């Protein structure tokens, strides 16, 4: 029930098994047995050794579209306000565009007297 370690081969080293290797540069390694240890010491890469966990996941041995947008209240207008504004669609919107044109048309007639 001690800390569970992992080897050069990626295997799981139970307590009382293998050896631990402390290099001069400060890195510490643990090997499950002398086979994994000798492979590590001879500088063999575990990605090229077939029975190694690193090799197996490297070669993968054995192993949609979404989006949503939600309406929110925006400071100065509750969700009710925006819905009512965007529900002016059934010609209420068209009613508002056309009164602005005539509300600027008579101003244009005043502007004609102001321009000229």
């Amino acid at each position: 029930m001690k800390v569970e370690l992992c080897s050069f081969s990626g295997y799981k080293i139970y307590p009382g098994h293998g050896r631990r290797y402390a290099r001069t540069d400060g890195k510490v390694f643990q090997f499950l047995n002398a086979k994994c240890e000798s492979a590590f010491l001879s500088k063999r890469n575990p990605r090229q050794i077939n029975w190694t966990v690193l090799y197996r996941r490297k070669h993968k041995k054995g192993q949609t579209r979404r989006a949503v947008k939600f309406q929110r209240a925006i400071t100065g207008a509750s969700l009710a306000d925006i819905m009512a504004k965007r529900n002016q669609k059934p010609e209420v919107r068209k009613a508002q565009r056309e009164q602005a044109i005539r509300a600027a048309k008579e101003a244009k007639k005043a502007k004609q007297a102001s321009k000229k």
Partner: protein
């Protein structure tokens, strides 16, 4: 308190180990081990955390032809640590100390065995890492 448990020695008299401190010494030639009563024909041997008497073979001339107290901090012989782990290091290394236990140098290159640390607090403080 708590005393040091027995460990595999692996460094007999006549072993030349590296000097891991900045004293200017490069190696340490173990001439004896402290606390060794011994036995006929048996070489006094030391492990990590053991105080030894050593003479530096190569290094700086003012350190050479003298006997220095030294403490082994790294060993290449595998040793068991009461919890099942067999630990060994890349080299045999030691540091030069006085009889009181204070390291003559100021910094240690490389790790220091845990047994050597809690046995020698002066060496432990100067240790960059502990294994």
């Amino acid at each position: 308190s708590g005393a040091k448990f027995r460990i595999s020695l692996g460094l007999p008299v006549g072993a030349v180990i590296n000097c891991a401190d900045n004293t200017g010494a490069k190696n340490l030639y173990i001439i004896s081990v402290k606390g060794i009563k011994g036995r006929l024909n048996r070489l006094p041997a030391a492990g990590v955390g053991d105080m030894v008497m050593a003479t530096v073979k190569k290094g700086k001339p003012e350190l050479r032809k003298k006997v220095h107290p030294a403490v082994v901090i790294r060993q290449r012989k595998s040793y068991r640590r009461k919890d099942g782990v067999f630990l060994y290091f890349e080299d045999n290394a030691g540091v030069i100390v006085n009889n009181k236990g204070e390291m003559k140098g100021s910094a240690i290159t490389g790790p220091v065995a845990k047994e050597c640390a809690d046995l020698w607090p002066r060496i432990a403080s100067n240790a960059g890492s502990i294994a």
